[PDB]
Amino acid sequence: AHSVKIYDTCIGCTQCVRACPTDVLEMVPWDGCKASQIASAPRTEDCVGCKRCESACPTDFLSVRVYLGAETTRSMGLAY
Amino acid sequence: MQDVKTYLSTAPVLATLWFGFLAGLLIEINRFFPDALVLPL
Amino acid sequence: KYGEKSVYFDLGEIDNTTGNWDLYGNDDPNRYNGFQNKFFETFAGAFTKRGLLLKFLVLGGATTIGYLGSTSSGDLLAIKNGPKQAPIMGPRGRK
Amino acid sequence: MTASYLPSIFVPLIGLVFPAITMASLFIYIEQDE
Amino acid sequence: EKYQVIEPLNGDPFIGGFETPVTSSPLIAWYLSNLPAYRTAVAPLLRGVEIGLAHGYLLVGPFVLAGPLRNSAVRGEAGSLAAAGLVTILTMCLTIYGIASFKEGEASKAPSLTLTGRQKEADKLQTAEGWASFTGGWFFGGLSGVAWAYFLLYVINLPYPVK
Amino acid sequence: VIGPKRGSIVKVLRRESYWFNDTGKVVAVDQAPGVRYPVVVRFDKVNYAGVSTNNYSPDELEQS
Amino acid sequence: TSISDSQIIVALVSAFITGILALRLGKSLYQ
Amino acid sequence: FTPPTLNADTPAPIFGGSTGGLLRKAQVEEFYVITWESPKEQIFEMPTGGAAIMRSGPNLLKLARKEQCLALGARLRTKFKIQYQFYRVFPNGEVQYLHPKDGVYPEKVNAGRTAVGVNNRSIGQNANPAELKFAHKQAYDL
Amino acid sequence: EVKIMVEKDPVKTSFEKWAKPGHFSRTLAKGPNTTTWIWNLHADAHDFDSHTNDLEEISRKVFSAHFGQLAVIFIWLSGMYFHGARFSNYEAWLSDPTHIKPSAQVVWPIVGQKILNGDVGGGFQGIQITSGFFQLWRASGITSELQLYTTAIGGLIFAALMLFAGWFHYHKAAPKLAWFQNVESMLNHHLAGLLGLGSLAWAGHQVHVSLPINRLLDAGVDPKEIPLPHEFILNRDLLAQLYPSFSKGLTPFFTLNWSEYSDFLTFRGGLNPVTGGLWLTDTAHHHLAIAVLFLVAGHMYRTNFGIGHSMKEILEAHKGPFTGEGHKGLYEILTTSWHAQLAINLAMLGSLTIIVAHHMYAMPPYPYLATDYATQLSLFTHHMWIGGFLVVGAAAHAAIFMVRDYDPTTQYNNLLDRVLRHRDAIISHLNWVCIFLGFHSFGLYIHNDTMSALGRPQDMFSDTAIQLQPVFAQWIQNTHALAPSLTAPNATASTSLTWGGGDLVAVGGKVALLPIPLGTADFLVHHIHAFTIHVTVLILLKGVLFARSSRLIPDKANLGFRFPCDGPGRGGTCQVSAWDHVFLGLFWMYNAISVVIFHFSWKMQSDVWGSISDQGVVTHITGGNFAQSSITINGWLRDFLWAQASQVIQSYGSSLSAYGLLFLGAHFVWAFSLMFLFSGRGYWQELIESIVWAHNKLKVAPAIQPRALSIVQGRAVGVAHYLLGGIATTWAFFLARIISVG
Ligand code: CLA
Ligand code: CLA
Numbered sequence A: 001a002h003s004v005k006i007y008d009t010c011i012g013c014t015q016c017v018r019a020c021p022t023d024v025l026e027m028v029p030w031d032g033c034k035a036s037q038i039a040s041a042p043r044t045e046d047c048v049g050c051k052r053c054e055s056a057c058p059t060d061f062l063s064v065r066v067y068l069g070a071e072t073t074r075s076m077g078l079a080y
Numbered sequence B: 001m002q003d004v005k006t007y008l009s010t011a012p013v014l015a016t017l018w019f020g021f022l023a024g025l026l027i028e029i030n031r032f033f034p035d036a037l038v039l040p041l
Numbered sequence C: 001k002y003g004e005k006s007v008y009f010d011l012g013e014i015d016n017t018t019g020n021w022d023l024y025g026n027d028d029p030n031r032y033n034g035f036q037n038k039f040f041e042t043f044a045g046a047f048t049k050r051g052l053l054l055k056f057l058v059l060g061g062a063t064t065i066g067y068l069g070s071t072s073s074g075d076l077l078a079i080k081n082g083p084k085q086a087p088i089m090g091p092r093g094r095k
Numbered sequence D: 001m002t003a004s005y006l007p008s009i010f011v012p013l014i015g016l017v018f019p020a021i022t023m024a025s026l027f028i029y030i031e032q033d034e
Numbered sequence E: 001e002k003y004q005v006i007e008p009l010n011g012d013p014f015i016g017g018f019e020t021p022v023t024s025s026p027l028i029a030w031y032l033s034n035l036p037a038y039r040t041a042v043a044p045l046l047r048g049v050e051i052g053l054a055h056g057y058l059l060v061g062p063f064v065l066a067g068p069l070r071n072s073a074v075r076g077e078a079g080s081l082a083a084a085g086l087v088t089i090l091t092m093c094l095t096i097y098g099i100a101s102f103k104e105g106e107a108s109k110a111p112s113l114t115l116t117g118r119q120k121e122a123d124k125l126q127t128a129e130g131w132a133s134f135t136g137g138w139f140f141g142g143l144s145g146v147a148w149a150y151f152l153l154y155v156i157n158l159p160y161p162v163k
Numbered sequence F: 001v002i003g004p005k006r007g008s009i010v011k012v013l014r015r016e017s018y019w020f021n022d023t024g025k026v027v028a029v030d031q032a033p034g035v036r037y038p039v040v041v042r043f044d045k046v047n048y049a050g051v052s053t054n055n056y057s058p059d060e061l062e063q064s
Numbered sequence G: 001t002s003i004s005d006s007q008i009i010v011a012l013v014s015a016f017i018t019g020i021l022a023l024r025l026g027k028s029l030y031q
Numbered sequence H: 001f002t003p004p005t006l007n008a009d010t011p012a013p014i015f016g017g018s019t020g021g022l023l024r025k026a027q028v029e030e031f032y033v034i035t036w037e038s039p040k041e042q043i044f045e046m047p048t049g050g051a052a053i054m055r056s057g058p059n060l061l062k063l064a065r066k067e068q069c070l071a072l073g074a075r076l077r078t079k080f081k082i083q084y085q086f087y088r089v090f091p092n093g094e095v096q097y098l099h100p101k102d103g104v105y106p107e108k109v110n111a112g113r114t115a116v117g118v119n120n121r122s123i124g125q126n127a128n129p130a131e132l133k134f135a136h137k138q139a140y141d142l
Numbered sequence I: 001e002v003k004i005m006v007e008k009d010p011v012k013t014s015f016e017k018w019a020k021p022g023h024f025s026r027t028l029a030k031g032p033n034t035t036t037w038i039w040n041l042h043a044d045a046h047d048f049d050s051h052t053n054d055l056e057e058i059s060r061k062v063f064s065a066h067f068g069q070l071a072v073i074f075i076w077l078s079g080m081y082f083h084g085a086r087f088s089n090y091e092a093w094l095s096d097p098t099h100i101k102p103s104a105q106v107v108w109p110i111v112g113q114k115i116l117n118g119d120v121g122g123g124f125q126g127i128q129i130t131s132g133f134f135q136l137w138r139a140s141g142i143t144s145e146l147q148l149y150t151t152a153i154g155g156l157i158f159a160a161l162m163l164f165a166g167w168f169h170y171h172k173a174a175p176k177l178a179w180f181q182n183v184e185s186m187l188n189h190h191l192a193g194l195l196g197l198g199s200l201a202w203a204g205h206q207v208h209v210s211l212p213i214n215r216l217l218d219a220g221v222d223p224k225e226i227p228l229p230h231e232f233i234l235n236r237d238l239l240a241q242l243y244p245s246f247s248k249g250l251t252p253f254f255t256l257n258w259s260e261y262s263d264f265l266t267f268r269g270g271l272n273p274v275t276g277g278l279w280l281t282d283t284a285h286h287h288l289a290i291a292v293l294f295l296v297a298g299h300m301y302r303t304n305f306g307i308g309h310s311m312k313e314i315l316e317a318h319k320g321p322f323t324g325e326g327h328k329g330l331y332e333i334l335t336t337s338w339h340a341q342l343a344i345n346l347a348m349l350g351s352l353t354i355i356v357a358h359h360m361y362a363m364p365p366y367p368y369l370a371t372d373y374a375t376q377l378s379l380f381t382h383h384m385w386i387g388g389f390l391v392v393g394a395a396a397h398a399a400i401f402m403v404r405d406y407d408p409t410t411q412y413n414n415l416l417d418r419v420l421r422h423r424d425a426i427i428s429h430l431n432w433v434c435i436f437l438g439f440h441s442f443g444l445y446i447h448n449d450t451m452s453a454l455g456r457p458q459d460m461f462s463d464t465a466i467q468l469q470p471v472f473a474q475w476i477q478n479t480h481a482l483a484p485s486l487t488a489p490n491a492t493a494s495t496s497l498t499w500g501g502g503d504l505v506a507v508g509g510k511v512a513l514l515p516i517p518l519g520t521a522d523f524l525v526h527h528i529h530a531f532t533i534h535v536t537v538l539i540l541l542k543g544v545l546f547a548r549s550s551r552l553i554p555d556k557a558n559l560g561f562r563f564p565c566d567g568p569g570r571g572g573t574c575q576v577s578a579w580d581h582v583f584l585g586l587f588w589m590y591n592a593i594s595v596v597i598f599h600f601s602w603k604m605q606s607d608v609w610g611s612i613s614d615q616g617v618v619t620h621i622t623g624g625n626f627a628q629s630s631i632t633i634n635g636w637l638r639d640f641l642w643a644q645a646s647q648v649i650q651s652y653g654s655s656l657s658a659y660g661l662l663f664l665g666a667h668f669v670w671a672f673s674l675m676f677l678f679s680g681r682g683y684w685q686e687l688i689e690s691i692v693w694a695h696n697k698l699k700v701a702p703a704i705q706p707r708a709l710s711i712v713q714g715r716a717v718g719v720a721h722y723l724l725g726g727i728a729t730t731w732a733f734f735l736a737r738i739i740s741v742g
């Protein structure tokens, strides 16, 4: 499906996980920020490409990036 | 009067006043100095 | 069970669970009695698919339309009737 | 025109038959699963 | 607690449908169940023959009364040939649809479960050879229906109000 | 210490930042070993998302 | 003067050969 | 954490039917099943359009998309304070536990979770597409 | 219990919040970080629901805003009456209404615009007005400019009164929520006291003022020596010599011998031959009857004296097997949501305005209105556009209610829930009917185009070809033409001269009305109208029904009512919000109303409007080419758009040159809208970044950061400019054409 990437600029605010409508992102332990956590995308095959996770990231430029592509059945959001 | 003067100093009110004054000036100038294509000098 | 209670999910009956029903699919086998002629006369189409039926259709459409367009008379088709009045002639004397 | 029947032949083909064959072949091709 | 005519599809509220008088009235359901398309036990060839006969027979009329030669003496022949050509084109449509949709040697994927849950046999119309037989029967029946309509209308000249 | 002093005016060297070649005020610097972007910078003007603060490493901030 | 039917059929044959070569080039571009 | 199994004896909510529901996709490709526990009979809004009463106890609802499952679950969590979990069901009878992969919701950080897709550099430090010409890989994949 | 409930001094009258622009909302009260804030300040000013969740405060704001609108309308009407009093030739038009063009606007001699002061007649120069105010004042019995002056002064007084009422009911004595929720009392008062009493009062005016003055005017009496209305009221012998039944003097009213009032309470129908308008006796009887009907109907609902109807009990009692609880929960919807009421009232007002447009040309209610073709066309087009806009607004506010005010808990198995539950079937069938109508109307037009271009006129759809006669409309006209004979025996004439009978009213040398014939062209154009209306309804109803959720975005209610999209995922979610559905329904309403007004204009200029000679030969403005030219799209392009636009483009150097100027300017505004409609937002944001660099190089960059318009704002600007340009182009074209040919 689409490709979702997380960068070291993340601050572990979890706001991208809460905005995801298909449960693609999750928070994992990390040691590069004060929050001691970082976002991750273990199940991007369920990603639809809404980039709501991108709109919720507060860093200057996005620590979470969605690149789109493939456009499989789950990606197109088809119920038929 | 502080609040009234502040409101009158807002962008739209001041724009209305300034542009109305400019339009009146131009209209009166054209009343007394109309239909000129060349600046006489 | 699908209908024992208000449950509508059952792995043992997935067709019922997913709604894969046939609403009007009557399976009564006794419809016609005399149908030997229809089986006999239809051999070019049945069990042919891409080989015979498609080629026959292409040939019998191409030849049919070619014959119709080549053998049509003037009255039926106006393009083959041809002009009948004098040329109308164009402006500036150009013809 | 040397052959007046030749337009009446060719125009129907390239107009109806050639599109029919072309679109049938392309529909069969783009619907293959392989 | 009232009568509540309208019901969900087979009692399942989570299937995308409804039970309406238009859908499953005893008369409407009986009518739809006995249409040749829904007679699954009957061979596809005969169902196709019936469908093509009906469709060519009904198609002859519009071409005859609306065609470009409707004011000429070949009006009937022109309309009948137009109906036959439409039947042939639709035969090519059916053939290519069967080629694209069905592969030889595969089982039918048509619903094999009734509303009650009898779990009948799957309809063979949704198969490569089933669809091929259906297409052949439809071609034969369409040509036959066009011929019959032309014969009744013009060769025999039965009295009809509009023609 | 790690980076600039608290309250100091720093200029951003991040090319992808909305505030490249812009001045901000340092709010806090974290001394935890492992933090990659510990310097917190407040800016007078917001970015497109509406955020007026960010985190930078000391190597992409210069003193005025 | 006007072209003859022999010329017409020569042109048709030449076009048919060019079509064969075109189909060949298309098959060569395909793979 | 041992994933729970999908029970087939869980009653469904009181719903009167809708045109927004399972379609041919549910029977040829896949569908989803959400389960939650409720303390009382209350009215909620179906994600497909409409209203229903949830049972005073276990519930079992079939959906066509994962996004609808998340929408209903989010409403349940932030409105009725109800824990939920859903599964992906295939036509062959395969059931896959989906949302709490480890039993903890993704918003809360949990140990034992692996970092997938995490890049150890800034977003602006990506390689240029020109350097990766004729190589079947992307700049963000490095 | 229905009682008066207010709060004393809820809001202090102070200018403190005037200095704070975005005080009404928490987000905008901080300040302008970006330029978007300014636009937001103007986009959330009247969204009172977004300001707070308190329904009482929202109701108070709505009441006071309505008072402000009433004051504005009073100012506007007072201005019209003032301009009739001073800058008008109303009295000259009274002396000769058939040869003097109405005019009530005079330009100043500044930049050569004085050419716009055309020779309208009566020793006057000014802009020729088409609002119909002259005919309305003629009907009201106004004969002097002093009466217009006193009306204007009263209008200013009433505007000040409404302004004070708004101030008083917001800042001094603000009604509580219980007061607003008394819907039964409100309906009783607005039916008996507003509509019924207003109709009764206007009937009184007509009986005592309009009828005598207008019948003296019809007799040829110079308006100067026509006695004043108070002389008719006081000297009742002067009124009785015009209508003898006044000598009876209210005895027939109370003895129930009402037939003795047949002198001035008639049921004639048709048109007055002298003026071409409706008989004012018929109008007076009409207004009296509807006043009685409304006063009776306003005694239906139970306020606090028992005897009446509870609308909640009426609604809850109406349910059936095909529905669930039926009309259960709708009382709470309509007594707790302002947006639902606004949707219903907007839809009804738009449909009512369309009815007004259709009924005011078939029965011209004012003297010398039918023969004033410019006024007729302007009134029809104006009220058509107003109605269309109101209907689209009703759709918008229905969507807003569905998004924000809808509560699933209190709406279970009722009508709204069940409509939401089979929206797929509704939209499927509406889409099918839209496609079918589009094909079998516009494809018929294209068929006609092709056969006309192929030299096969016998294969077309026309009267000399395959005919599609509107037999049902023709039968309805036939039935209405014979109504006085058998079905309404107490009628002299039919409802309108448009039904039939061979009667032609020709005031002066023009034609007022005549039997309108319907043929293949009318069949085609009505089916085009049906197609456009169904497509607009499709767009709007699909927006309303899918506002909360859909198979694409199941949580669209959380996104809101006015949002751009949900992202490029699921293939792209552009314009999924109900606001965008309204945005497209505006375009489709534009097309529908445009085709409707074009059909009206061509049909009237072709078959109805014209001049009659002394012998009796009736010639038409266009020449009756609608029956054979409207069947072809080329016919519309040539015989209507090209032929009838010859006057707007040749109007330069004359008093109609302003119409040509605005014709071209409206074209410009439409083309300008095209880029807000076609372009995006990232492109303009990057261009703005480059411009901001240019400004920063010179230390002139503003602290309020320039931003491109939002996506929703881009769409709003595009649609606003598009509609303005199109509607103004048509306005200029019609006005120039109909002033030239009339
Ligand atoms: C690209 C060049 C070209 C074009 C646009 C046309 C166009 C036309 N031709 Mg002509 N023709 C051409 C070349 C061309 N011809 C050549 C080279 C020959 C010599 C064999 C002919 C011989 C010919 C005859 C004998 C007749 C026409 C006729 C016609 C008309 C109907 C179409 C038809 O029956 O085609 C038939 C065309 C052929 C049999 C020639 C083969 C096709 C040529 C070689 C072009 C194919 C490749 C070309 C690049 C298209 C690529 C497809 C797409 C990617 C664009 C139409 C006006 C008919 C007419 O006059 O009706 C009034 C007719 O009877 N054509
Ligand atoms: C550019 C190619 C092209 C050509 C050559 C034609 C040719 C024709 N069209 Mg046109 N048509 C075209 C494109 C074309 N069409 C397109 C693109 C459209 C859609 C806008 C139409 C829409 C159209 C309409 C709506 C009508 C025509 C009709 C006709 C026929 C004229 C009347 C006639 O022959 O007498 C009367 C006809 C006959 C005596 C015989 C017609 C029946 C023969 C047997 C057809 C051949 C069938 C054959 C088995 C299959 C061959 C094709 C297959 C391989 C795909 C003529 C055959 C008229 C007609 O009669 O329709 C049938 C008519 O009403 N056409």
Ligand code: CLA
Pocket (backbone or CB within 6 Å): I011, I012, I013, I014, I015, I017, I018, I019, I024, I060, I061, I062, I064, I065, I067, I068, I072, I163, I164, I165, I166, I167, I170, I171
């Ligand atoms: C001079 C008397 C006066 C004073 C001092 C106030 C003071 C106040 N009012 Mg009150 N009010 C008054 C008269 C007054 N009002 C009257 C007469 C009405 C009846 C209409 C109201 C109705 C009213 C409501 C309903 C509300 C207020 C509110 C407010 C507060 C903020 C208003 C503000 O800043 O917006 C200033 C806004 C403007 C100056 C815009 C004026 C727009 C006018 C009315 C329409 C003009 C239309 C124009 C002709 C056409 C434009 C287009 C044209 C150019 C082409 C403030 C306490 C609000 C409040 O308390 O906030 C919670 C609130 O909700 N007032």
Ligand code: CLA
Pocket (backbone or CB within 6 Å): I077, I131, I132, I133, I135, I136, I349, I352, I353, I356, I366, I379, I382, I383, I386
């Ligand atoms: C932007 C809004 C707008 C504008 C500028 C106009 C402008 C105009 N209208 Mg239109 N109109 C509108 C909206 C608008 N209208 C709407 C929404 C309706 C539907 C209610 C109407 C219905 C209407 C009628 C029926 C008439 C006009 C007339 C006029 C002209 C004004 C002459 C006058 O003062 O007579 C003022 C109007 C009258 C004296 C007669 C009105 C009689 C109605 C039945 C009374 C209204 C009842 C009630 C208050 C409305 C709500 C009903 C609802 C509760 C069921 C002028 C062209 C008149 C005209 O064309 O004169 C030449 C005319 O007869 N309009």
Ligand code: CLA
Pocket (backbone or CB within 6 Å): I062, I063, I066, I067, I070, I179, I180, I182, I183, I185, I186, I189, I190, I192, I193, I194
């Ligand atoms: C016979 C009683 C009566 C009458 C005549 C009206 C008349 C009106 N009401 Mg209603 N109303 C009534 C009783 C009445 N109301 C009751 C009992 C309630 C409480 C349940 C309401 C609650 C109510 C609301 C909530 C609203 C109205 C609105 C309106 C106005 C709509 C605009 C319009 O078309 O008016 C056409 C007619 C005119 C414009 C003429 C000018 C108005 C004259 C002066 C009549 C005013 C009558 C008034 C009710 C008498 C009390 C005031 C007195 C103390 C001076 C209209 C003037 C709406 C409005 O616009 O508010 C301003 C609105 O939002 N009314």
Ligand code: CLA
Pocket (backbone or CB within 6 Å): I042, I043, I044, I045, I046, I047, I048, I342, I346, I389, I390, I391, I392, I393, I394, I396, I397, I400, I561, I562, I579, I582, I720, I724
């Ligand atoms: C009784 C009539 C009525 C009433 C009371 C309202 C009231 C409201 N509407 Mg509704 N609406 C109506 C009719 C009505 N509308 C109609 C007829 C339409 C169809 C066009 C709509 C379409 C509509 C939409 C699509 C939306 C609203 C919104 C709103 C809210 C206003 C918030 C806002 O931004 O406004 C502030 C005022 C403006 C933005 C107006 C600015 C000026 C406009 C855009 C252009 C003026 C054109 C002008 C005539 C051009 C010529 C002059 C020019 C040369 C200077 C408020 C609840 C909004 C809302 O509630 O959002 C949640 C919203 O999104 N309405």
Ligand code: CLA
Pocket (backbone or CB within 6 Å): I431, I432, I434, I435, I436, I437, I438, I439, I442, I443, I444, I446, I535, I538, I539, I584, I587, I588
């Ligand atoms: C002239 C320009 C134009 C045309 C033709 C259309 C056509 C259509 N629009 Mg679009 N639309 C347009 C401009 C146009 N729109 C613009 C500018 C806007 C912006 C506001 C929209 C916004 C819009 C929306 C929001 C919606 C539509 C809808 C529709 C459909 C109407 C119903 C239908 O499908 O059957 C009628 C179809 C036609 C009239 C198309 C022409 C068909 C002709 C008559 C026959 C030609 C066929 C012929 C045999 C040739 C065959 C070709 C073959 C040889 C290849 C149709 C697809 C609605 C829809 O989806 O349908 C319900 C819908 O919801 N449109």
